[PDB]
Structure formats: C-alpha cells, structure tokens
Design a protein around this ligand. Structure first.
Ligand SMILES: [Ca+2]
Ligand SMILES: [Ca+2]
Ligand SMILES: [Ca+2]
Ligand SMILES: [Ca+2]
Lengths: 89, 85
C-alpha cells in the first residue's frame, strides 16, 4: 500500500546515506549533511548550521543520528509541510 | 520535482487527507474514517481494535485524530517496520 511504500522509502533513504562511513546504521555529520543537502534541498540556512542540527537530534548524545532520532525529524517536517498545504483558507 | 524523501513525506500527508476528508471535519479522522485508513493502508491490521487505536492516539480527547496525532502513529510504525528487517 502507498503508506507502506512510503515508510519503506524513509528506511531506505536513511541507510543510503548512513552506510557510507563507519557504523552503517548511524549518520555521522558527513552523512547527515549529505542526506540533508540531497534529500531536503534548502533546509539549511543562517557559521555552520549542520552542527546545530545534530545537536538537536542526537538525543543520547553520541555524535551520530540513528533511525529513531531521524524519524523525530521526518515527523516534524511532515507536520509543517501539512499545515502549509492544508489550511481552511 | 521533490526528492525521494520528500515524495514519501507527501504520500503520508496525502494518505491522511484521503481518509480525513470523507465526513465531518475534513482535517480530522473520525472513528469510521480511522477504521477505513487502517484496513486499506496497513496490510497486516487485524480486528474492537480500532477503539484502542482511537483512545491511544486521541491525545487531546476530542474523539477524532488530527494530523499531529496521526503522525504519532506513522512514526511509531516506521521504527517498528525498521525493527522487523
Ligand atoms: Ca555511517
Ligand atoms: Ca544519537
Ligand atoms: Ca473527517
Ligand atoms: Ca484528537
């Protein structure tokens, strides 16, 4: 089903950039940045914003973003994108 | 032209709107609409389990699931899908 394919895409995208350096299930900054710039063009602004973004997602604090912390991100970006396209104008 | 990640996110939002706009508030899932979503979008869903899924997701207690509460479901399911692999 469409929903199931979508969650499959979220998993596959994560590992497509998570499996490039070191632990193939955790995103280091080079992999997080790679995911952000390639999958979310324009999400970064403002002096290095990439540091801020792992600082917020790295919940346990090991310097890498795993799947659950990455899902915390996808969720917030999904709800904001929804409010932007689905308002009782 | 969105990215693969972006396309997938759109699908989630679209799926929710696909069942949310059937009756009542076009931006909230009623009990009947929630049943419809589970049965069509989750190939494994067995079944009153919908009541459980309602009381579990209805954080604010209005009797309907809005988007912010439906993402709680999608997120929990996504990590659960990832565990299964
Ligand atoms: Ca890695
Ligand atoms: Ca972490
Ligand atoms: Ca509705
Ligand atoms: Ca609610």
């Amino acid at each position: 089903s469409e929903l199931e394919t979508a969650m499959e895409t979220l998993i596959n995208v994560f590992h497509a950039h998570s499996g490039k350096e070191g632990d193939k299930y955790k995103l280091s900054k080079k992999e997080l940045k790679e995911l952000l710039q390639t999958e979310l063009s324009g999400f970064l602004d403002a002096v290095d914003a990439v540091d801020k973004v792992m600082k917020e997602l790295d919940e346990n604090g090991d310097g890498e973003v795993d799947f659950q912390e990455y899902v915390v991100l996808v969720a917030a970006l999904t709800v904001a994108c929804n409010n932007f396209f689905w308002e009782n104008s």
